[PDB]
Design a protein around this ligand. Structure first.
Ligand code: ERY
Ligand code: GTP
Ligand code: MG
Ligand code: MG
Ligand code: MG
Length: 293
């Protein structure tokens, strides 16, 4: 897409943009543009990459209106939310990490060992997970009960194995995990559902100030909101995060740490399931790579 193409799309939605813009291709769902309007306001544009995304756009809009009422940190304040374009004013701080546009390598915008990141991330996790189930239900978001989690993952495994394939090693791990009763919590809570450093905004000291990408939010296993952390920060950091979260009153179980590791390891299964649901071949090919087939 050209700069002029983006200017025309934005003008079609009442947003008059300068030609000063740069592109972020990190996301699978949306191409993002850092843009600047002729009054000097910085804008974040999210342009759907696939056909048939209208419902997820309207769902994410509803999610954001729900969560902004409950969180101390900023979330995107959508002003345009058509089937063609999503736009919100840029948030205050940079994400904790970015990908290098050329190399695609992680660029860290804070010291990853920042202690403030752990304590403030614990607080944000506590606030997200505190959102009342009644409000989630009233907003027509998916609610998974504890009894739903293992049957769903088992269905996911059968579907991915049948449609794409899975290595024998990954299958064995996933089936041990599904059978390991003590790992699974007896409660579910409202979660972000795609939470990792790429979606957390912080000042340079590591104090979390915002969370961005919200289409996945629903009630589910809380460990899902810890797996992205252990994937990039490691097991001892995860242990510290769990300790800080419990200090705030976050609901835990003895095996939350172990469950989080298995959720992190289930990333390829979740990617394969997502790719199949999109029906997008390029995505399915990428998932098949991670599945070891
Ligand atoms: C550092 C940067 C890397 O991010 C991660 O590794 C984090 C830690 C994953 O979250 C991990 C951890 C966790 C908990 O998500 C936070 C888990 O749910 C997912 C499956 O895997 C991400 C984000 C996953 O994306 C998410 O995949 C979901 C299936 C759908 C979701 N979105 C489009 C709706 C999408 O953003 C997923 C599968 O790795 C994307 C594929 C394409 C990649 O391999 C890409 C190249 C990643 O390596 C990455 C972006 O470079
Ligand atoms: N600084 C800054 N970067 C942002 C902001 N919103 C999005 N980004 C960047 O744009 C990228 C893609 O935007 P997302 O909304 O995550 O796109 P997506 O397609 O939903 O992403 P995934 O579902 O994770 O694949 C993010 O990973 C950030 O690097 C923002 O408000 N500020
Ligand atoms: Mg994203
Ligand atoms: Mg049990
Ligand atoms: Mg997203």
């Amino acid at each position: 897409m050209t700069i002029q193409d983006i200017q025309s799309l934005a003008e079609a939605h009442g947003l008059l943009l300068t030609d000063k813009m740069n592109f972020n291709e990190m996301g699978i769902d949306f191409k993002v543009v850092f843009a600047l309007d002729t009054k000097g306001q910085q804008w974040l544009l999210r342009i759907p990459r696939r056909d048939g995304m209208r419902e997820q756009i309207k769902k994410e809009k509803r999610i954001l209106e729900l969560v902004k009422k409950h969180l101390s940190v900023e979330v995107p304040d959508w002003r345009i939310s058509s089937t063609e374009l999503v736009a919100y004013p840029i948030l205050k701080d940079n994400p904790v990490l970015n990908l290098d546009a050329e190399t695609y390598e992680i660029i860290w915008n804070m010291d990853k060992d920042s202690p403030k990141y752990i304590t403030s991330l614990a607080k944000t996790l506590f606030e997200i997970h505190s959102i009342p189930e009644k409000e989630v239900r009233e907003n027509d978001l998916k609610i998974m009960k504890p009894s739903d989690l293992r049957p769903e993952i088992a269905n996911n495994l059968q579907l991915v194995k049948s449609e794409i394939g899975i290595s024998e090693q990954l299958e064995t791990r996933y089936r041990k995990w599904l059978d390991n009763d003590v790992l699974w919590a007896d409660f579910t809570q409202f979660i972000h559902g795609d939470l990792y450093a790429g979606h957390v905004l912080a000042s340079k000291d590591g104090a979390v100030s915002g969370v961005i990408d919200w289409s996945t939010a629903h009630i589910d296993d809380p460990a899902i909101d810890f797996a992205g952390h252990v994937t990039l920060f490691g097991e001892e950091s995860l242990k510290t995060l769990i300790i800080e979260y419990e200090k705030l009153g976050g609901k835990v179980w003895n095996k939350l740490y172990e469950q989080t590791l298995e959720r992190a390891a289930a990333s390829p299964l979740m990617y394969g399931l997502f790719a199949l649901e999109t029906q997008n071949e390029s995505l399915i090919v990428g998932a098949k790579a991670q599945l070891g087939v």
